[PDB]
Design a protein around this ligand. Sequence first.
Ligand SMILES: O=c1nc(Cc2ccccc2)[nH]c2[nH]c3cccc(O)c3c12
Ligand SMILES: [Zn+2]
Length: 114
Amino acid sequence: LSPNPPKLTKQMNAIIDTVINYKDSSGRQLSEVFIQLPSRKELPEYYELIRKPVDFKKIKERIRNHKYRSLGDLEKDVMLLCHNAQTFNLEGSQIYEDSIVLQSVFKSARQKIA
Ligand SMILES: O=c1nc(Cc2ccccc2)[nH]c2[nH]c3cccc(O)c3c12
Ligand SMILES: [Zn+2]
């Protein structure tokens, strides 16, 4: 392909920063637990269950290192993050429900920015 235009890189960061900075009615930053996954030594149970792990740190690195070739590719990884959160955590639990919100916050951001 062609290198990531500065405008696309700026859009990808603007979208991910909306998700990360997002807060609920209570004043809680939902992304907090999703920024960094615990290590394989800290939580081996998660790595046994989850095939393709990702956190917001890895997504920022993939934006920075021009790994996402479209906003669709970025979406695929944000959707994967949330799916893993929904797979590993019990339905109705805080982490599980926060991931459903962040999925929506991403789509809202994507359509607003792009
Ligand atoms: O599903 C997850 N469960 C926990 C459980 C936990 C909570 C608090 C302290 C220690 C462990 N931490 C997590 N960090 C993430 C990062 C990205 C994606 C994720 O799906 C997760 C994720
Ligand atoms: Zn799956």
